[PDB]
Scaffold this active site. Structure first.
Site, mmCIF file in Angstrom:
data_model
loop_
_atom_site.group_PDB
_atom_site.id
_atom_site.type_symbol
_atom_site.label_atom_id
_atom_site.label_comp_id
_atom_site.label_asym_id
_atom_site.label_seq_id
_atom_site.Cartn_x
_atom_site.Cartn_y
_atom_site.Cartn_z
ATOM 1 N N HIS A 156 0.771 -1.229 0.000
ATOM 2 C CA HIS A 156 0.000 0.000 0.000
ATOM 3 C C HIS A 156 0.823 1.311 0.000
ATOM 4 O O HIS A 156 0.230 2.404 0.065
ATOM 5 C CB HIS A 156 -1.024 -0.017 1.130
ATOM 6 C CG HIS A 156 -2.349 -0.429 0.587
ATOM 7 N ND1 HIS A 156 -3.255 0.511 0.104
ATOM 8 C CD2 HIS A 156 -2.813 -1.674 0.301
ATOM 9 C CE1 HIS A 156 -4.258 -0.196 -0.407
ATOM 10 N NE2 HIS A 156 -4.029 -1.510 -0.321
ATOM 11 N N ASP A 158 -8.029 3.581 8.967
ATOM 12 C CA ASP A 158 -9.354 3.649 8.326
ATOM 13 C C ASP A 158 -9.552 2.384 7.462
ATOM 14 O O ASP A 158 -10.674 1.942 7.256
ATOM 15 C CB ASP A 158 -9.450 4.866 7.351
ATOM 16 C CG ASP A 158 -9.367 6.261 7.943
ATOM 17 O OD1 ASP A 158 -9.544 6.403 9.173
ATOM 18 O OD2 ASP A 158 -9.113 7.211 7.173
ATOM 19 N N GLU A 192 -13.183 12.152 13.309
ATOM 20 C CA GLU A 192 -12.607 12.470 12.019
ATOM 21 C C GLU A 192 -13.382 13.632 11.389
ATOM 22 O O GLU A 192 -14.222 14.262 12.027
ATOM 23 C CB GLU A 192 -12.474 11.264 11.079
ATOM 24 C CG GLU A 192 -11.376 10.304 11.489
ATOM 25 C CD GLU A 192 -10.929 9.340 10.421
ATOM 26 O OE1 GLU A 192 -10.311 8.320 10.792
ATOM 27 O OE2 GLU A 192 -11.221 9.568 9.224
HETATM 28 C C1 LIG Z 1 -3.305 1.944 0.296
HETATM 29 C C2 LIG Z 1 -3.878 2.501 1.573
HETATM 30 C C3 LIG Z 1 -3.012 2.909 2.584
HETATM 31 C C4 LIG Z 1 -3.497 3.422 3.790
HETATM 32 C C5 LIG Z 1 -4.889 3.507 3.997
HETATM 33 C C6 LIG Z 1 -5.756 3.089 2.982
HETATM 34 C C7 LIG Z 1 -5.272 2.600 1.771
HETATM 35 C C8 LIG Z 1 -6.248 2.255 0.671
HETATM 36 N N1 LIG Z 1 -5.429 3.998 5.178
HETATM 37 C C9 LIG Z 1 -4.593 4.345 6.137
HETATM 38 C C10 LIG Z 1 -5.139 4.819 7.375
HETATM 39 O O1 LIG Z 1 -6.315 4.991 7.614
HETATM 40 N N2 LIG Z 1 -4.200 5.129 8.335
HETATM 41 C C11 LIG Z 1 -2.829 5.009 8.195
HETATM 42 O O2 LIG Z 1 -2.109 5.291 9.159
HETATM 43 N N3 LIG Z 1 -2.313 4.589 7.015
HETATM 44 C C12 LIG Z 1 -3.149 4.285 6.029
HETATM 45 N N4 LIG Z 1 -2.635 3.862 4.836
HETATM 46 C C13 LIG Z 1 -1.174 3.902 4.648
HETATM 47 C C14 LIG Z 1 -0.439 2.668 5.165
HETATM 48 O O3 LIG Z 1 -0.351 2.722 6.591
HETATM 49 C C15 LIG Z 1 0.963 2.567 4.558
HETATM 50 O O4 LIG Z 1 0.827 2.318 3.158
HETATM 51 C C16 LIG Z 1 1.957 1.563 5.146
HETATM 52 O O5 LIG Z 1 3.093 1.488 4.285
HETATM 53 C C17 LIG Z 1 1.387 0.188 5.444
HETATM 54 O O6 LIG Z 1 0.964 -0.486 4.239
HETATM 55 P P1 LIG Z 1 1.510 -2.017 3.968
HETATM 56 O O7 LIG Z 1 1.113 -2.993 5.000
HETATM 57 O O8 LIG Z 1 1.008 -2.420 2.600
HETATM 58 O O9 LIG Z 1 3.101 -1.991 3.877
HETATM 59 P P2 LIG Z 1 4.101 -1.681 2.671
HETATM 60 O O10 LIG Z 1 3.549 -0.557 1.871
HETATM 61 O O11 LIG Z 1 4.332 -2.982 1.888
HETATM 62 O O12 LIG Z 1 5.472 -1.302 3.442
HETATM 63 C C18 LIG Z 1 5.699 0.056 3.893
HETATM 64 C C19 LIG Z 1 7.102 0.169 4.438
HETATM 65 O O13 LIG Z 1 7.237 -0.705 5.585
HETATM 66 C C20 LIG Z 1 8.183 -1.723 5.313
HETATM 67 N N5 LIG Z 1 7.691 -2.969 5.900
HETATM 68 C C21 LIG Z 1 6.610 -3.721 5.514
HETATM 69 N N6 LIG Z 1 6.340 -4.719 6.321
HETATM 70 C C22 LIG Z 1 7.330 -4.635 7.292
HETATM 71 C C23 LIG Z 1 7.625 -5.424 8.423
HETATM 72 N N7 LIG Z 1 6.940 -6.519 8.772
HETATM 73 N N8 LIG Z 1 8.671 -5.047 9.194
HETATM 74 C C24 LIG Z 1 9.362 -3.951 8.858
HETATM 75 N N9 LIG Z 1 9.187 -3.143 7.814
HETATM 76 C C25 LIG Z 1 8.157 -3.550 7.053
HETATM 77 C C26 LIG Z 1 8.391 -1.734 3.793
HETATM 78 O O14 LIG Z 1 9.640 -2.288 3.375
HETATM 79 C C27 LIG Z 1 8.211 -0.245 3.473
HETATM 80 O O15 LIG Z 1 9.388 0.514 3.697
HETATM 81 O O1 LIG Z 2 -6.965 6.172 3.112
HETATM 82 C C1 LIG Z 2 -7.469 6.561 4.151
HETATM 83 N N1 LIG Z 2 -8.863 6.557 4.368
HETATM 84 C C2 LIG Z 2 -9.886 6.315 3.426
HETATM 85 C C3 LIG Z 2 -11.187 6.656 3.798
HETATM 86 C C4 LIG Z 2 -12.233 6.575 2.876
HETATM 87 C C5 LIG Z 2 -11.968 6.248 1.554
HETATM 88 C C6 LIG Z 2 -10.659 5.994 1.152
HETATM 89 O O2 LIG Z 2 -10.356 5.843 -0.216
HETATM 90 C C7 LIG Z 2 -10.224 4.553 -0.737
HETATM 91 F F1 LIG Z 2 -9.881 4.679 -2.022
HETATM 92 F F2 LIG Z 2 -11.417 3.951 -0.629
HETATM 93 F F3 LIG Z 2 -9.259 3.866 -0.100
HETATM 94 C C8 LIG Z 2 -9.619 6.098 2.078
HETATM 95 N N2 LIG Z 2 -6.702 7.073 5.225
HETATM 96 C C9 LIG Z 2 -5.290 7.275 5.284
HETATM 97 C C10 LIG Z 2 -4.442 7.076 4.179
HETATM 98 C C11 LIG Z 2 -3.070 7.328 4.282
HETATM 99 C C12 LIG Z 2 -2.548 7.865 5.454
HETATM 100 C C13 LIG Z 2 -3.408 8.139 6.520
HETATM 101 C C14 LIG Z 2 -4.780 7.904 6.427
HETATM 102 C C15 LIG Z 2 -5.680 8.224 7.620
HETATM 103 C C16 LIG Z 2 -6.609 9.389 7.346
HETATM 104 O O3 LIG Z 2 -7.710 9.293 8.229
#
Ligand SMILES: *Cc1cc2c(cc1C)nc1c(=O)[nH]c(=O)nc-1n2C[C@H](O)[C@H](O)[C@H](O)COP(=O)(O)OP(=O)(O)OC[C@H]1O[C@@H](n2cnc3c(N)ncnc32)[C@H](O)[C@@H]1O
Ligand SMILES: O=C(Nc1cccc(OC(F)(F)F)c1)Nc1ccccc1CCO
Length: 453
Positions: free
Chosen positions: A61, A124, A236
């Site tokens: 993500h 979220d 929020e």
């Molecule tokens: C795509 C997305 C992201 C998202 C979200 C909704 C969507 C549709 N809503 C969020 C929310 O409400 N609140 C929030 O704080 N973040 C939100 N996000 C963003 C999301 O937290 C980040 O994208 C984050 O990177 C986690 O996503 P994911 O699990 O897919 O991890 P990744 O993108 O592959 O990795 C991100 C970085 O972390 C390192 N990594 C991954 N796994 C590990 C472990 N186990 N240990 C250490 N490091 C790790 C990756 O290498 C990279 O640097």
């Molecule tokens: O992605 C979200 N929330 C969300 C809420 C409603 C619809 C959304 O759009 C999506 F396309 F359906 F994912 C996203 N939050 C997020 C993303 C990156 C970093 C931090 C946050 C937390 C904001 O509350």
């Protein structure tokens, strides 16, 4: 125990992310069975003459290739026997040990079916990994009260950049523990996280109310996060365009179970009576706890049905000091964005819920906002992505030009001086010293682009 894969479908997945721009390809994808396999692969990278890049991938993500390991190996942390939740008389609550690659949606389903327990701080969207969110912060409407997900973890097992497996917490190897939390994957791969749990509510009273005045909207959000004592469990907000002039939507919830079901109606009414929203703009929904927490996955299914999910996502997330939020509305919501699709979320949080020992970077102010610009580019339209990227740069230029001490959440910085500026002198020194100790060869999470071998 694990296996290296060169399957084109595996290489392609590990070469992309939700951002849809960064495409650095690895040589192979590693599928571990347990922590020792992750340790073996990182150990081999550390021992190799070349010192190839190793990055863990959660659910992919990332917006700008943070989980990509150019010509190295991507560890597919996705999922075996699961640990049951545990009660501790010493902690005075429950916890659960989870694999670093576990998705929060799978954690929730596991803990609910084993004692009706659940984490108290969310994101979220639940289709994110535990290791992935804990390497950033993990933020949603509960963070003002419980702090982010990095404030709701007791212990970790970390595979360092030297391939060593270390158990850490506040009492054991605290430097590694606090370093890893909000650490952007720089000091190791989380293979286990011990998540704090509470008895889960059964249902949610989900409320939305509209505002035309930004000063009243923010004043009400700031009062709500300071409560109580009667309080909402989630706070929020989001920015709305006149069609469907700027409108602001306050979004709150009140969690309840069988015991509190008889007081939920009056609690909600007492709290709402003290607010200043536009009369006749209160919308209410009553639904199960799991259904509320999974609300974004439902938005996802509707997007996949329209071919509007696998599009570029030039997302920008900023932490804005509460002292500069008024100026931010004038210049950004009314200015830069005045006049492709996507929400713009906005809500305040309390800095005292964030442990200052972690690697997370917040503004130097007790109350700050998360402003999330979650806009999607049009499908198969590269100019839509380009125009959105120009708008993001105009937002950063506005913060820079007016001296707003904003900080990027999920930082997308490239230059060393940009990172120096992001962390500040004291935090940069602590960060670099931790890198020298736990990943001296800069093998891990190189896609973040902070360090080089
Ligand atoms: C795509 C997305 C992201 C998202 C979200 C909704 C969507 C549709 N809503 C969020 C929310 O409400 N609140 C929030 O704080 N973040 C939100 N996000 C963003 C999301 O937290 C980040 O994208 C984050 O990177 C986690 O996503 P994911 O699990 O897919 O991890 P990744 O993108 O592959 O990795 C991100 C970085 O972390 C390192 N990594 C991954 N796994 C590990 C472990 N186990 N240990 C250490 N490091 C790790 C990756 O290498 C990279 O640097
Ligand atoms: O992605 C979200 N929330 C969300 C809420 C409603 C619809 C959304 O759009 C999506 F396309 F359906 F994912 C996203 N939050 C997020 C993303 C990156 C970093 C931090 C946050 C937390 C904001 O509350």
């Amino acid at each position: 125990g694990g296996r290296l894969s060169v399957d084109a479908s595996d290489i392609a997945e590990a070469s992309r992310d939700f951002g849809g721009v960064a495409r650095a390809e690895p040589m192979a994808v590693f599928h571990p069975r347990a922590a020792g396999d992750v340790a073996g692969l990182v150990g081999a990278a550390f021992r190799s003459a070349r010192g190839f890049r190793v990055s863990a991938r959660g659910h992919g993500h990332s917006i700008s290739g943070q989980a990509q390991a150019a010509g190295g190996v991507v560890v597919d942390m996705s999922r075996v026997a699961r640990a049951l939740p545990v009660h501790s008389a010493a902690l005075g609550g429950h916890y659960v040990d989870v694999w670093g690659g576990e998705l929060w949606v799978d954690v929730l389903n596991w803990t609910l079916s084993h004692g009706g327990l659940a984490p108290r701080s969310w994101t979220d969207y639940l289709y994110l990994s535990v290791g992935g969110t804990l390497s950033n912060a993990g933020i949603s409407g509960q963070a003002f009260h419980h702090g982010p997900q990095i404030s709701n973890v007791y212990e970790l097992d970390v595979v360092t950049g030297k391939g060593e497996v270390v158990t850490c917490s506040e009492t054991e190897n605290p430097d590694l523990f606090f370093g890893v939390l909000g650490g952007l994957g720089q000091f190791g791969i989380i293979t286990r996280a011990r998540i704090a749990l509470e008895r889960a509510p059964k249902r949610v009273r989900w409320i939305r109310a509209l505002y035309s005045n930004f000063s009243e909207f923010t004043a009400d959000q700031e009062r709500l996060i300071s409560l109580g004592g009667r309080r909402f469990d989630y706070v929020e907000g989001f920015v709305v365009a006149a069609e469907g002039s700027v409108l602001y939507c306050l979004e709150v919830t009140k969690n309840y179970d069988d015991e509190t079901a008889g007081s939920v109606d009056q609690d909600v009414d007492t709290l709402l009576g003290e607010l200043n929203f536009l009369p006749g703009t209160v919308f209410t929904t009553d639904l199960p706890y799991v259904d509320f927490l999974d609300r974004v996955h439902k938005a996802e299914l509707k997007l996949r049905a329209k071919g509007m999910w696998e599009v570029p996502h030039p997302w920008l997330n900023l932490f804005v000091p509460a002292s500069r939020i008024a100026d931010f509305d004038r210049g950004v919501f009314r200015g830069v964005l005045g006049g492709a699709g996507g929400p713009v979320l906005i809500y305040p949080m309390n800095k005292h819920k964030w442990d200052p020992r972690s690697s997370a970077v917040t503004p130097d102010e007790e109350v700050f906002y998360l402003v999330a610009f979650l806009r999607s580019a049009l499908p198969g339209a590269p100019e839509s992505l380009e125009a959105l990227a120009r708008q993001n740069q105009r937002i950063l230029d506005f913060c820079a030009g007016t001296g707003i001490g904003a900080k990027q959440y999920l930082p997308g910085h490239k230059a060393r001086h940009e990172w120096a500026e992001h962390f500040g002198a004291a935090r940069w020194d602590r960060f670099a010293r931790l890198k020298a100790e736990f990943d001296p060869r800069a093998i891990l999470a190189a896609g973040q682009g902070i360090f080089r071998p």
